[PDB]
Amino acid sequence: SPAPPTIGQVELEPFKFNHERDQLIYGYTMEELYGKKFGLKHSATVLREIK
């Protein structure tokens, strides 16, 4: 019987902290795995008014 892969104790939790995420993403980055997170997407008129 092949040995099962190891599962971390803190793994299987509903959410993760920073070092837990660092454990999970050892080969990759946030953008490559989770995607892009956007704060606000102002329109052209709003951006022009802000400048």
């Binding site: 946030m30 953008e31 892009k36 997170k37 956007f38 704060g39 606000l40 997407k41 102002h42 709003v46």
Partner: protein, 218 residues
């Protein structure tokens, strides 16, 4: 549940301008700007956006230094909300709006001839959820069946009106009176004299209300 439903998806109404029920100005470009704010990651959890910005910097600086909570809410509550006229009802000189169905002080009624309506059927006694009604009956020497005792503990009563609904001759009613405050616990032990005089005093208003209520089904 108990019927069939081949298509559970409720399709949206027709959006064509040709349609009779087309609703222009339903969507407002100035107001409906949710596409701007729907992609914010702050609305979905504890996470932070990939890039912060000077707009957030300016917002935080405005919130932390100017402290608008001391002028926004102060003005907008105080002045405007104080401009509105008052709501108070002057109780000694005005009364709050009631209805002919209002359940107040109990009374025993009479026929227009002066005869008691109550025939001691004890339906009101068994209808009482609080067991507040006690009735004892003897044949009156002329032969009619009348109560020798009919009393209600007003400290047991829950003022529910089940007894006036159960009465088949409209003998026991709940009147419009609510100013029945007493100084002794024994003043709230209502016997037949008290209920009879309550009926003899409040008969016009009770008659008017019952007249309207009777005419309602008709």
């Amino acid at each position: 549940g108990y019927i069939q439903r081949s298509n559970i998806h409720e399709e949206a109404p027709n959006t064509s301008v040709e349609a009779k029920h087309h609703n222009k100005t339903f969507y407002d470009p100035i107001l409906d700007i949710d596409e701007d704010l729907k992609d914010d990651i702050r609305l979905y959890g504890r996470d932070k956006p990939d890039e912060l910005d000077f707009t957030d910097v300016w917002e935080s600086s405005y919130q932390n230094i100017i402290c608008p909570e001391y002028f926004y809410h102060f003005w907008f509550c105080g002045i405007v909300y104080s401009f509105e006229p008052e709501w108070t009802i002057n109780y000694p000189f005005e009364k709050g709006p009631l209805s002919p169905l209002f359940r107040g002080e109990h009374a025993l009624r009479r026929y227009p001839t002066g005869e008691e309506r109550c025939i001691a059927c004890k339906l009101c006694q068994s209808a009482c959820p609080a067991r507040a009604i006690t009735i004892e009956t003897e044949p009156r020497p002329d032969g009619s069946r009348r109560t020798v005792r009919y009393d209600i503990d007003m400290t047991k009563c829950i003022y529910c009106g089940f007894c006036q609904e159960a009465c088949p001759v409209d003998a026991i009613v709940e009147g419009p009176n609510y100013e029945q405050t007493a100084y002794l616990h024994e003043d709230l032990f209502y016997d037949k004299y008290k209920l009879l005089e309550n009926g003899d005093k409040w008969e016009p208003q009770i008659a008017r209300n019952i007249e309207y209520l009777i005419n309602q089904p008709l």
